[PDB]
Amino acid sequence: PTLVSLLEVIEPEVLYAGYDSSVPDSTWRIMTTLNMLGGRQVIAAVKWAKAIPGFRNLHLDDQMTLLQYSWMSLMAFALGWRSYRQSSANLLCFAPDLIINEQRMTLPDMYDQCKHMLYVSSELHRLQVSYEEYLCMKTLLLLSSVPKDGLKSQELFDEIRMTYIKELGKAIVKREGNSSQNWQRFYQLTKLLDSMHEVVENLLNYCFQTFLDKTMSIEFPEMLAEIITNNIKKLLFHQ
Ligand SMILES: CC#C[C@]1(O)CC[C@H]2[C@@H]3CCC4=CC(=O)CCC4=C3[C@@H](c3ccc(N(C)C)cc3)C[C@@]21C
């Protein structure tokens, strides 16, 4: 079996959000629903990553560090892919039952958040990215940041990232070109991967949880310790 065929088989199914359209939309209802769906997608990202060949032989500390640094990137990228594929990049397709149409986008705070995710979709559309390219690109997002002080098994990590870079290469060559166009396309796709760092930067500035949510989650002694208690190398193909 080829390596991309194995990526295809472990690719997560698309989850429903459990949003009901029988109530008028509100920003609260959508964000609340997205909170639940986002937790579920993280669980599915971990399960996917744990079956990535190479990656899965890193110590768990390395695997968990990589996931910590990349889960938002992976979810925004797959969101981008879904939106491109289901709606030709017209609409943000969080889930088959939760699509942000032109009207939901005028809801308070929707445009500002969504415009960053719609950028991913529109780039996949502009570049006409193939499914095999997408699978390899998405694995590379898992391997796109490391601790400043290095992983436990940095040498293995290097080997694994290089094998998925070469896999991306093989997906571009299959899709097509007469030499100049393979390298142009490699340039373009690796620029998109780089730009995912900036997408995630914007997306991290949004509200994770409220005070009510925080209060219900934690016992007071533990929150106290947190209060008393008051680095990352972004791997770039291009400077
Ligand atoms: C509209 C909107 C919006 C956002 O606030 C910004 C990016 C969304 C994120 C992208 C990546 C993402 C892709 C999806 O498929 C919707 C799920 C999703 C989200 C949302 C989310 C909510 C909670 C978490 N936690 C608790 C693990 C993770 C993701 C909502 C995000 C943060």
Swiss-Prot record:
Task: Tell me what happens on changing residue 150 to S.
Answer: In GCCR; has 50% binding affinity
State the residue spans of region: Interaction with CRY1: 3-168
Look up what happens after changing residue 218 to M: In GCCR; alters interaction with NCOA2 and strongly reduces transcription activation; acts as a dominant negative mutant
- Tissue specificity comment: Widely expressed including bone, stomach, lung, liver, colon, breast, ovary, pancreas and kidney. In the heart, detected in left and right atria, left and right ventricles, aorta, apex, intraventricular septum, and atrioventricular node as well as whole adult and fetal heart.
The record lists the effect of residue 30 to N as: In GCCR; interferes with translocation to the nucleus and thereby strongly reduces transcription activation; is equally impaired in nuclear export; acts as dominant negative mutant
Post-translational modification summary for this protein: Acetylation by CLOCK reduces its binding to glucocorticoid response elements and its transcriptional activity. Increased proteasome-mediated degradation in response to glucocorticoids. Isoform Alpha-B appears to be more susceptible to proteolytic degradation than isoform Alpha.
Q: Where is the NR LBD domain?
A: 1-229
Q: Impact of changing residue 42 to A on the protein?
A: In pseudohermaphroditism; female with hypokalemia due to glucocorticoid resistance; 6-fold reduction in binding affinity compared with the wild-type receptor
How it assembles, according to the record, is: Heteromultimeric cytoplasmic complex with HSP90AA1, HSPA1A/HSPA1B, and FKBP5 or another immunophilin such as PPID, STIP1, or the immunophilin homolog PPP5C. Upon ligand binding FKBP5 dissociates from the complex and FKBP4 takes its place, thereby linking the complex to dynein and mediating transport to the nucleus, where the complex dissociates. Probably forms a complex composed of chaperones HSP90 and HSP70, co-chaperones CDC37, PPP5C, TSC1 and client protein TSC2, CDK4, AKT, RAF1 and NR3C1; this complex does not contain co-chaperones STIP1/HOP and PTGES3/p23. Directly interacts with UNC45A.
Any notes on this protein's domains? Answer: Composed of three domains: a modulating N-terminal domain, a DNA-binding domain and a C-terminal ligand-binding domain. The ligand-binding domain is required for correct chromosome segregation during mitosis although ligand binding is not required.
So what does this one do?
Receptor for glucocorticoids (GC). Has a dual mode of action: as a transcription factor that binds to glucocorticoid response elements (GRE), both for nuclear and mitochondrial DNA, and as a modulator of other transcription factors. Affects inflammatory responses, cellular proliferation and differentiation in target tissues. Involved in chromatin remodeling. Plays a role in rapid mRNA degradation by binding to the 5' UTR of target mRNAs and interacting with PNRC2 in a ligand-dependent manner which recruits the RNA helicase UPF1 and the mRNA-decapping enzyme DCP1A, leading to RNA decay.
Medical condition linked? Glucocorticoid resistance, generalized: An autosomal dominant disease characterized by increased plasma cortisol concentration and high urinary free cortisol, resistance to adrenal suppression by dexamethasone, and the absence of Cushing syndrome typical signs. Clinical features include hypoglycemia, hypertension, metabolic alkalosis, chronic fatigue and profound anxiety.
What is the name attached to this protein's record?
Answer: Glucocorticoid receptor
Which species does the entry assign this protein to? Homo sapiens
